[model samples]
Target: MKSVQTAATSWGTVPSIRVYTANNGKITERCWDGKGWYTGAFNEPGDNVSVTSWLVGSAIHIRVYASTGTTTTEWCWDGNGWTKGAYTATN
Candidate 1:
């Protein structure tokens, strides 16, 4: 599936978020740090049907919408590792 959103921060030095669906029907995220993609440790379960993102401070926060559309998980990455949150339906 094609990505529905690729949101980036043009204000300052920040991570550029790329949201896309892979061949496995898994929605994955990649972070661009001006030079190149800085994502390696971040992984997904593939049940995500859609995704959106936000740049807060030096970290990137991603909200994933699951296939059930009932619960969405929140994730944050800051080059070191991703900080994930529980699934919830609403924004």
Candidate 2:
């Protein structure tokens, strides 16, 4: 529940960010395109998700950590919009 801002590390291209949003236990990523930042398409792994990100040329390289195992979860990011990678896990 802190102020959202930029990270100390970046993909050495565009400005990148990692944030833990207020009112939600989600860890998310974003990109700074001169004017401002835009959210990445995905990376919400689980409850209290943790974050890491980079601005690698035309993409935002990111990973969100959560319950880990061979439980099988599909996660993807276009470094742009939204997604449904949480389709199913066959748990």
lDDT of each: 0.51, 0.47
17-69, model 2: which lDDT tens digit per residue?
44533124344556455567676444554444444555567667554444334
- Superposed by TM-score, candidate 2 places the C-alpha of residue 78 at a distance from the truth, in angstroms, of 7.7
TM-score to native of every candidate shown: 0.46, 0.39
Give the top-scoring candidate (TM-score).
Answer: 1
Model 1 stretches astray by more than 4 angstroms: 1-15, 55-59, 68-72, 76-80
Candidate 1 overall lDDT versus native: 0.51
lDDT, residue 65, candidate 2: 40
| Candidate 1: residue pairs that collide | 72-88
State the TM-score for model 1: 0.46
